[PDB]
Amino acid sequence: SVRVMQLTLGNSTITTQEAANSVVAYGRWPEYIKDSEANPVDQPTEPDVAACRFYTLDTVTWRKESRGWWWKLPDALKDMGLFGQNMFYHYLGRAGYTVHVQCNASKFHQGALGVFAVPEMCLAGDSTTHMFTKYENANPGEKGGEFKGSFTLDTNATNPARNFCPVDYLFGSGVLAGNAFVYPHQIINLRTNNCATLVLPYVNSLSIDSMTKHNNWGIAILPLAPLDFATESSTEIPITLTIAPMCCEFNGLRNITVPRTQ
Amino acid sequence: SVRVMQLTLGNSTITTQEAANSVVAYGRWPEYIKDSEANPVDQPTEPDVAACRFYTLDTVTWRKESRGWWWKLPDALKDMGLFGQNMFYHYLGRAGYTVHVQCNASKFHQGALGVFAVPEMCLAGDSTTHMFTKYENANPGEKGGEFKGSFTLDTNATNPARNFCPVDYLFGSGVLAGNAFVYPHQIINLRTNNCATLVLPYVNSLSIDSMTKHNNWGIAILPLAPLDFATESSTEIPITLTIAPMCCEFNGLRNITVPRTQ
Amino acid sequence: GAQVSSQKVGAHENSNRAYGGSTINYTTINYYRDSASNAASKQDFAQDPSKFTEPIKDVLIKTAPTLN
Amino acid sequence: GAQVSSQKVGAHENSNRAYGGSTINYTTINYYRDSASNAASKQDFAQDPSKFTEPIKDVLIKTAPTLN
Amino acid sequence: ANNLPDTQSSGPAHSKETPALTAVETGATNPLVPSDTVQTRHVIQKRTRSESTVESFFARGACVAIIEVDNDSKLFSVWKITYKDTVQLRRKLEFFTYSRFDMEFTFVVTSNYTDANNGHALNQVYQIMYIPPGAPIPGKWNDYTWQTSSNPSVFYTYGAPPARISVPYVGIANAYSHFYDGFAKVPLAGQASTEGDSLYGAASLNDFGSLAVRVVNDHNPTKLTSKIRVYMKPKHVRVWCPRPPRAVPYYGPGVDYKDGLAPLPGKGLTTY
Amino acid sequence: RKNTMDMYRVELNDAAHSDTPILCLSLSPASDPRLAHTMLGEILNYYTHWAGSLKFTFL
Amino acid sequence: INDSFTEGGYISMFYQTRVVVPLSTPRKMDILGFVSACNDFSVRLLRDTTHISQEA
Numbered sequence A, B: 001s002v003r004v005m006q007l008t009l010g011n012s013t014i015t016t017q018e019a020a021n022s023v024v025a026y027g028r029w030p031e032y033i034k035d036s037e038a039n040p041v042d043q044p045t046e047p048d049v050a051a052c053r054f055y056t057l058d059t060v061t062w063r064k065e066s067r068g069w070w071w072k073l074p075d076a077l078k079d080m081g082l083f084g085q086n087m088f089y090h091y092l093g094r095a096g097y098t099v100h101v102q103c104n105a106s107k108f109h110q111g112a113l114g115v116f117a118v119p120e121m122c123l124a125g126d127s128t129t130h131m132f133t134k135y136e137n138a139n140p141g142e143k144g145g146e147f148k149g150s151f152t153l154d155t156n157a158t159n160p161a162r163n164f165c166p167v168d169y170l171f172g173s174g175v176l177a178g179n180a181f182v183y184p185h186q187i188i189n190l191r192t193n194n195c196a197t198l199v200l201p202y203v204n205s206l207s208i209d210s211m212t213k214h215n216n217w218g219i220a221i222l223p224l225a226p227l228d229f230a231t232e233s234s235t236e237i238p239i240t241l242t243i244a245p246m247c248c249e250f251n252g253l254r255n256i257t258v259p260r261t262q
Numbered sequence C, D: 001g002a003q004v005s006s007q008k009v010g011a012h013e014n015s016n017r018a019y020g021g022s023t024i025n026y027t028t029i030n031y032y033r034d035s036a037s038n039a040a041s042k043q044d045f046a047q048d049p050s051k052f053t054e055p056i057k058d059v060l061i062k063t064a065p066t067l068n
Numbered sequence E: 001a002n003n004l005p006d007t008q009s010s011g012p013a014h015s016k017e018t019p020a021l022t023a024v025e026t027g028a029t030n031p032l033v034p035s036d037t038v039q040t041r042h043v044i045q046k047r048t049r050s051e052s053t054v055e056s057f058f059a060r061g062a063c064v065a066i067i068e069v070d071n072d073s074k075l076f077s078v079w080k081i082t083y084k085d086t087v088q089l090r091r092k093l094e095f096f097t098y099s100r101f102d103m104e105f106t107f108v109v110t111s112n113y114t115d116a117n118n119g120h121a122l123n124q125v126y127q128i129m130y131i132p133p134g135a136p137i138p139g140k141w142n143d144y145t146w147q148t149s150s151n152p153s154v155f156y157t158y159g160a161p162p163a164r165i166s167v168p169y170v171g172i173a174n175a176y177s178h179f180y181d182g183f184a185k186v187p188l189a190g191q192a193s194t195e196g197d198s199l200y201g202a203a204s205l206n207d208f209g210s211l212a213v214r215v216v217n218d219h220n221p222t223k224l225t226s227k228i229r230v231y232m233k234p235k236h237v238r239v240w241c242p243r244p245p246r247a248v249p250y251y252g253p254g255v256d257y258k259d260g261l262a263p264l265p266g267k268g269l270t271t272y
Numbered sequence F: 001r002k003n004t005m006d007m008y009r010v011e012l013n014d015a016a017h018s019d020t021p022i023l024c025l026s027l028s029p030a031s032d033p034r035l036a037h038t039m040l041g042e043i044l045n046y047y048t049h050w051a052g053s054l055k056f057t058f059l
Numbered sequence G: 001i002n003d004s005f006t007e008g009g010y011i012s013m014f015y016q017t018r019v020v021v022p023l024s025t026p027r028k029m030d031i032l033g034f035v036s037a038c039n040d041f042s043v044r045l046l047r048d049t050t051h052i053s054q055e056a
């Protein structure tokens, strides 16, 4: 039925008994580069089962006060097994994804989470200096980031944070959040479903790019209807994020990249 | 001609203008596991170009006093790019190799090196305790080891070295070195060739095995005729070893193995 | 289920039986189900030593120059 | 009254006899009238475990929901 | 196991073909025959290599163990199955890296009175029980383990022709390894040195199990000793990867050496 | 719990998410104490070698 | 038998999210585990078990 599914990729399987169908972004399933759209001339590496499998990133907790969370792809998976290895050993890389967000509660809980997949999800910074966010802050990895309820300008001139300041109702980029529904999405309304499943093809203005310099997709999760339970002002339910890269192919092998951190 | 060749694997090419043909061990070219000889049921990973390419291990120097050198496969390549990554991430692994030994001199130099590829190259230890050599000593990695001119028993009971003591004329295993010619080999006689090239298929009593627990091939280089030059008692010529794994396929993916060292 | 093979007669008796007939044949019948119980037939084949004697990639003629 | 069956050859000798002929067959003859005196043929069949593994009245598919 | 080629007559030569010259650097052996370097006559070859086939080379029962039992815990003995307790068969097997065959075991049993003028006993019956790795090992010459409801046992009556049984290819790999360049464990980073340590060149701690031998008769105060000599013959043989034979004395189950390291005698370079 | 009906029960709770294991086992079907006495383990103890796939069902 | 050469690996279980129950519901519950062989499973070399003994 629309509600029961099983996803198998490599050596990993995911089962769900409360789905609300699955979304295939823009109606496009991920695919490899065709010869007619090929650019780099060298033989690509395609790890296949070693990289195209389900990786579970860290679990976040939803509370009445949560504003939202965000992650960047392939960034969030840079340290994930052999996918991360191939990402750092190659100059160029390409991949699609199957994003599976998990969140179960009970029949006496309420709340709705909007799960959006955004191509080129550029976020707003914290200073008066334009495009000032530094690489280390823009790429948090598997832990991702969070949305805020208001904009707060960083004034420390001696030691600028050079970080993002994504305000939730402004979708972290100066647009109204209610219009974010034009992007592939699903809603995890506690009275209806457990999860959200989105299949994302590779989207870019090029056939292949640098995975370290460029993040193709952004995953934004916003509480559309806040978490509430029985009478417990105190309520916490975890949100686990499991993502699997698809049709990975890398070009331009050399020595490994070791990016600067923190 | 028998003397000029070019080997291309992945993004690496080797050229030689003074070869003496190439040896294909036991007349078998490396191949992948056939369905009729398959054992582990999971889908294998085949890195292909990312792992099957030429890796240059450290250069050793040949002097009038050198006794010989040895390496173990896949051990010597455990830290080599994506080949090493796949080796450590998988429980099982299989690979063949193209071993290219390099050694050029001049028309006024003499010397002959015997290059042997030995399946299950077990070496002799240094103590009265049988099979006492410890894992860390048996697996030196890319730096490999050396042969000795005589057997010297380790007597330190408090701190036994638990190392090998490979005597050269005993082929490091209690057999006469002159009979080592029953193993696939080539000879680098300075007046004739620059190198030795050996193509090694996967040899084992199983179709696939643990690459960390077991070394399939051993490479032994012994000075059959010592290095000599003009009148320079002082002469040193480097010996570079370049090896390329072939038809790599791994099974049993999990978390990465981090072996104990030194 | 009898297997009848012929022997390779070494020393010959002054008989025609030493040169022909069932007199230079031997009979065999397996009594056990497991092949392990069987004796060795000893009608064993040979092969080409080339895999050891000439494991060379580019085949060479003895009359022709090895180093070319 | 001889019964000739074939063996399942495990280790093969470097002979063609190890791959064919009466050399991979074994012969049997019963000497006693009572079947109790007979040896075990060991050419034994198998069966479906379903009577134990799935003694269910309404047959179900693994892909399909068990509880329907 | 066949014929050798005939020698063809060969006359004189004056050509640009020089089979006598070669280059052993290639790793190949020069396939010359007499007619390549001398004038030969035609000889019809009748010699064959029938006795040097891999099968005929091993087709002999070799002693691999001498198990002893004293019928006055010695009332029973246990022998860990191996081919390395003796040297002769071991050296022949080690001409190759891997092997695959069936085995035939013949047991020669001898016994005698320790005392020239004392004691007496009725004819002895022996039980040779095979204990596959995992099965319970006997603690007493008469405990429950000797019931052999599943383990294969051989009951031998003293004086009868030597007992004999056949064993199939029982390896857990596709061939037996005469050499194993590895360990059964990989020491992991962080664990105590006591951890992850194993013998070099060893596979399973108990490869093939062992044999438990005992005299079934009730022991009499008489002093008696028996010895079971185990003979094994590989039949239906296949071998892979030749290796040079052992030149120095064996020093354990491994390739370790220690003592007879100078096997060759002296001989003048120009002395016939 | 061993040697009582409680040896078969593994308890879970509604506590906040933790990354620590609920249970751990080694794939030694004939020797691991938790597997050695199941019908599968009992049969494996009458044989020296085993090969094949296994499946664990949780209720 | 327990032997490193033929070791099989590890089985473990973790919470993906967490067990959630509403009010008036038990906060602790049990799970039971079952094990069986697949259709490609086989055993060989009949031997005696250590699971049964007999004293005297």
Ligand SMILES: COc1ccc(OCc2ccc(COc3c(Cl)cccc3Cl)cc2)c(Cl)c1
Binding pocket: E064, E081, E082, E083, E093, E099, E103, E105, E128, E129, E130, E152, E153, E154, E165, E167, E170, E176, E177, E178, E208, E211, E232
């Ligand atoms: C590479 O060379 C090899 C490989 C394996 C070997 O031993 C394997 C082996 C396994 C089981 C048995 C058990 O055999 C027996 C039985 Cl069922 C019943 C009674 C007596 C015996 Cl004796 C005997 C040998 C030997 Cl000796 C040499």
